[PDB]
Design a protein around this nucleic acid. Structure first.
Lengths: 159, 130, 145, 177, 66, 26, 74, 108
RNA sequence: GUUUGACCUCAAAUCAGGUAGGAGUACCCGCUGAACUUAAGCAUAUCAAUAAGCGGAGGAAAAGAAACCAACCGGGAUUGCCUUAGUAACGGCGAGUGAAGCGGCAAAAGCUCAAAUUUGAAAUCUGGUACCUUCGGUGCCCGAGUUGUAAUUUGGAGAGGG
RNA sequence: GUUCUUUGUAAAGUGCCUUCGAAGAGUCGAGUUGUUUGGGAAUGCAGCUCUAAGUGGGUGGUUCCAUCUAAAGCUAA
RNA sequence: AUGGUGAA
């Protein structure tokens, strides 16, 4: 028997919505260690001989995400269900519901790791966005709130 | 003793160390003016009174300026980077001395520093240059 | 008519001599209520509100060698401080207890507090001992035989 | 960040959420060995506030001990014998059964070069810290030795054998007192 | 220490034992035993004997009423 | 019963100023 | 204690958030039912026996009163 | 049964220890500038003795900073408090006199 | 896609680099623990928070920067010595047991985490390899690491800016 | 002492003004069974049961006041 | 008594 705050997970986001979430999220990769290093050597070769705006990426640290929700800066928050200590993330759907930040439980922790240059991530969030994907993001917010939140209003109940 | 009996018996020898004279006559090491003016025949406290300098700052338990002037003798006797200087050249030639315009500027003053920061660095720039 | 309850309570810090006195008198009193611990004064009225106890004995503990016992009543009790250096009991008393209101009031307390109600929860029919109460050198002396 | 939420979540131990985690894990830890290595600490907030950094050289052994000398120190002593190259830093409670208690004792490799460098943890490399648990120099050992500050700890502050030898051996000066 | 509030305490606190039986009271008021007449107050000789008699003779007052 | 979270939050839980490091390029 | 321990809006938020998300412990699950049936008197008795001192049991039963009253109404 | 045969030996030990500390800490006076403190308990309150360390308050009123105070050889205590006014005055005068006496060498 | 690919976990090897055992043991730190003997026989007091046994260290160890002592015109990490003192206190008040704060002195030294975001860029480290001025430095590759490694902070506050 | 190199809008410190400002839980504590002591306010520890709080909590002094901040760690003489 | 060595 599962106490309602556990198994608020497993009632995860479905097939098509999850695919569309990654269609958005895979656009916003953090610049990998190799890519970042080569860019700075390009900067070294250029600026030593002879401007840029703030670049948007996903935010992916548990401490960073728990900061961003309640900041409030997070817009979408993805949460993996499979976590070795489950108690690490059990409060997080409740925190998002309380602060009114739209969240989604995604399926697979390594699935979050792929979009983020890590092995696993447990939580991923998209704070800010480029102007072109703004309408698409807000549409996905409504899509997730209709599919995830409104269908499973009774997820806080039932063992 | 068991082990000591062998060491006296063996043809290996003992690691003979004569280091009892050095435990008393310690050379001063940390000041050259003192290194010249320090009578080793005298003690620690007697050497301090001979110099002038205090050996103890508290009221001591029990009972009891040629050099100090030379210490007062030795008591009698930072730029900006290339990018920083060249960046300040860009600001000065653009605005002049309008620090309000200079910090509300976006293209040249990228890191949004205050009026006080920019003007201080310009004062240092105006010393090395015009 | 005489239906009362006793409530032996103690502050942080009680052993050997004082815990001999606490445990044996808790055994000797069939209507006694043995409680864990307390730390301070105003709370003691609400302790009586829980068990409907008609009496209270509070062992306060101060300067490392002494003793400070506090005796009081539930609703509007006038407390008296002390400084001392399971059958039905028989309660003996003194002439000099009745000499002043100072000792007459504490006599009344020692009758129904340290004695017994006849309708106690652990009340035994057979008798065993007496209770000696008397005054000498401005202080009380109690021995049980 | 999350460590405040975890800190407060670990307070309500018999509450529905944490109660369920206990009954699953108590079964799971019985399946495994008596002394075995967990890859990550189950209560990571507690691991941190007892001095664990999630870098190479830190090891979290999970240990099982019988119920009814102290059990925390026995837990540390058991892992000390098995993992002899490591140095015991601290231990903490994770889960318990009617018959057994579980502790997640945290260890440091003094031989690993990631610890021999950084000055925040290179103190453990010093040979004065070989088997800290076998001398009661851990948190629980210092607790059982009665070593604190106060009137309570007068007869056992700076070694209970040391104060005994001081009090029960005659001292005489050259010019007698 | 005033005796006004002491007498006010005798009003409210004190229960009337004379209206009830000795069964309900169970308290022998061993009167006329002043006990300031006891010899050797610091040696504890007559203090033992006079109190022991004060306790045992009190039983016989209650014995008829029992 | 999701009792406390039904009353949805308004200001963030802190009041910390946000530094100049989160504006001018890093 | 100049730095005694001020309210701190964040800490109050976290404590009350965890207070509901965790649920209720078995003694508290018994205790809240014991309030509604047997009154606040017997509730304080069981809480004093379960916990250490009475001073703990007061604030505990008071916290239960706040939880019950805020749950049913709002 | 311990006997202190080494009373003469350990005085020579302690003296040579001070001699080494003098040789290594050449111009400096072996010990730190300690405050002047009123002793506790009714019995000893008439006595005024050497305290442990000054305070942030006494150091701040003297005209120097806490971290800098330790580098110039002033013992600084942080748990001690300035309840008495006369002690506070005496220590401030002690520091100001000390600051007139000191000759802090340059780092070049 | 009835393929394939991420991870997590369990493996493996005469692979690469390491490390632990044993001796010594006066001192130190833990663990375990008698009896002859003392008050009258012996359950405590008493031999004894001993000896033996067991485990673990070092040039010392342990202790240590207060969840301290105090009741004062307050002291101010710890350790040791002198004294407090054979005092308080306990002990079929008896064999007797036996401190501590203060005071004088010896020596004096303080600090590091966990704690709210680097989020305009994991700023960190291991290892392999190539060179170099080799108790190491640098380039390159690899791995660890966001289930948090660096910088900044530890209440003496501190941080954000001006 | 003698030099060779010091850089980057780099690293701090100090005073004023302005806006914030989180500090350790199967732990504290409670009952009991043993051990520890000469320990009278079971001191200290362990075992077992239950197990907190944040204008908090621990310790002391005659109705308040004083005093520190546990449950993490390092450190010469 | 503690610890050990031997043993129809």
């Amino acid at each position: 028997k599962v106490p309602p705050t556990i198994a608020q997970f497993q009632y995860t986001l479905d097939r098509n919505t999850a695919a569309e979430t990654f269609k958005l999220f895979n656009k916003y990769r953090p610049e990998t260690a190799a890519e970042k290093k080569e860019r700075l050597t390009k900067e070294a070769a250029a600026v030593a001989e002879g401007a840029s705006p703030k670049p948007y990426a996903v935010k992916y640290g548990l401490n960073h995400v728990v900061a961003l929700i309640e900041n409030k800066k997070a817009k979408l928050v993805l949460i993996a269900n499979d976590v070795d200590p489950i108690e690490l993330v059990v409060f997080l759907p409740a925190l998002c519901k309380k602060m009114g930040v739209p969240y989604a439980i995604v399926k697979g922790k390594a699935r979050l790791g792929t979009l983020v240059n890590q092995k696993t991530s447990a939580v991923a969030a998209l704070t800010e966005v480029r102007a072109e994907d703004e309408a698409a993001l807000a549409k996905l917010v409504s899509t997730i709130d209709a599919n995830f939140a409104d269908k499973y209003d009774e997820v806080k109940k039932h063992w | 003793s068991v082990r000591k009996r062998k060491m006296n018996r063996s043809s290996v020898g003992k690691a003979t160390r004569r280091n009892k004279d050095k435990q008393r006559k310690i050379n001063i090491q940390s000041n050259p003016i003192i290194a010249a003016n320090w009578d080793y025949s005298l003690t620690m406290a007697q050497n301090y009174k001979k110099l002038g300098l205090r050996a103890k700052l508290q009221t001591p338990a029990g009972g009891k300026e040629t050099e100090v002037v030379k210490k007062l003798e030795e008591l009698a006797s930072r730029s900006q980077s290339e990018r920083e200087e060249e960046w300040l050249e860009k600001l000065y030639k653009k605005h002049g001395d309008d620090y309000k315009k200079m910090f509300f500027d976006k293209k040249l003053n990228i890191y949004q520093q205050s009026e006080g920061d920019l003007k201080r660095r310009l004062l240092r720039w105006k010393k090395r240059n015009g | 008519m005489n239906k009362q309850r006793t409530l032996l309570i103690s502050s942080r810090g009680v052993n050997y001599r004082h815990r001999h006195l606490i445990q044996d008198l808790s055994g000797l009193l069939p209507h006694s209520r043995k409680e864990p611990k307390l730390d301070t004064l105003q709370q003691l009225n609400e302790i009586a509100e829980l068990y409907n106890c008609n009496n209270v004995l509070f062992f306060e503990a101060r300067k490392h060698q002494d003793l400070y016992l506090w005796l009081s009543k539930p609703p509007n009790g006038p407390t008296i401080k002390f400084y001392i250096q399971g059958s039905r009991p028989v309660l003996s008393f003194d002439q000099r207890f009745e000499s002043s209101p100072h000792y007459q009031l504490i006599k009344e307390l020692l009758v129904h507090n340290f004695g017994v109600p006849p309708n106690a929860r652990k009340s035994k029919p057979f008798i065993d001992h007496v209770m000696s109460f008397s005054i000498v050198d401005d202080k009380i002396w109690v021995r049980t035989y | 960040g999350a460590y405040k939420y975890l800190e407060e979540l670990q307070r309500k131990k018999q509450s529905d959420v944490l109660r369920f985690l206990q009954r699953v894990r108590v079964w799971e830890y019985r399946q495994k060995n008596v002394i075995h290595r967990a890859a990550r600490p189950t209560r990571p907030d507690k691991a941190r506030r007892l001095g664990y950094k999630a870098k190479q050289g830190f090891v979290i052994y999970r240990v099982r001990v019988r119920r009814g000398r102290s059990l925390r120190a026995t837990a540390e002593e058991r892992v000390g014998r098995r993992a002899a190259n490591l140095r015991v830093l601290n231990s903490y409670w994770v889960n318990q059964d009617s018959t057994y208690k579980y502790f997640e004792v945290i260890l440091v490799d003094p031989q690993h070069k990631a610890i021999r460098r950084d000055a925040r943890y290179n103190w453990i490399c010093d040979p004065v810290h070989k088997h800290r648990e076998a001398r009661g120099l851990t948190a629980t050992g210092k607790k059982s030795r009665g070593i604190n500050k106060g009137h309570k700890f007068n007869n056992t502050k700076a070694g209970r054998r040391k104060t005994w030898k001081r009090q029960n051996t005659l001292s005489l000066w050259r010019y007698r007192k | 220490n005033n005796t006004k509030a002491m007498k006010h305490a005798l009003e409210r606190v004190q229960l009337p034992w004379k209206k009830h039986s000795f069964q309900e009271h169970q308290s022998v008021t061993s009167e006329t035993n002043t006990d300031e007449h006891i010899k050797d107050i610091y040696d504890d000789t007559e203090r033992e004997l006079a109190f022991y008699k004060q306790s045992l003779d009190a039983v016989l007052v209650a014995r008829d009423e029992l | 019963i999701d009792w406390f979270t039904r009353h949805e939050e308004v200001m963030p839980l802190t009041a910390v100023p946000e530094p100049k490091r989160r504006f001018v390029p890093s | 204690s100049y730095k005694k321990g001020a309210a701190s809006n964040r800490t109050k938020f976290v404590r009350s958030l965890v207070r509901e998300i965790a649920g209720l412990s078995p003694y508290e699950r018994r205790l809240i039912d014991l309030i509604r049936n047997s009154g606040e008197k017997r509730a304080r008795k069981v809480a004093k026996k379960r916990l250490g001192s009475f001073t703990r049991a007061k604030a505990k039963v008071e916290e239960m009163n706040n939880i019950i009253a805020a749950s049913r109404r709002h | 049964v311990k006997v202190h045969f080494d009373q003469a030996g350990k005085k020579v030990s302690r003296r040579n220890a001070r001699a080494t500390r003098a040789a290594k800490i050449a111009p400096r006076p072996l010990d730190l500038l300690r405050p002047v403190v009123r002793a506790p308990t009714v019995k000893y309150n008439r006595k005024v003795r050497a305290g442990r360390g000054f305070t942030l308050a006494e150091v701040k009123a003297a005209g120097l900073t806490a971290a800098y105070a330790r580098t110039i050889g002033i013992a600084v205590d942080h748990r001690r408090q300035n309840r008495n006014q006369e002690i506070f005055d005496a220590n401030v005068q002690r520091l100001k006199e000390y600051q007139s006496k000191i000759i802090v060498f340059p780092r070049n």
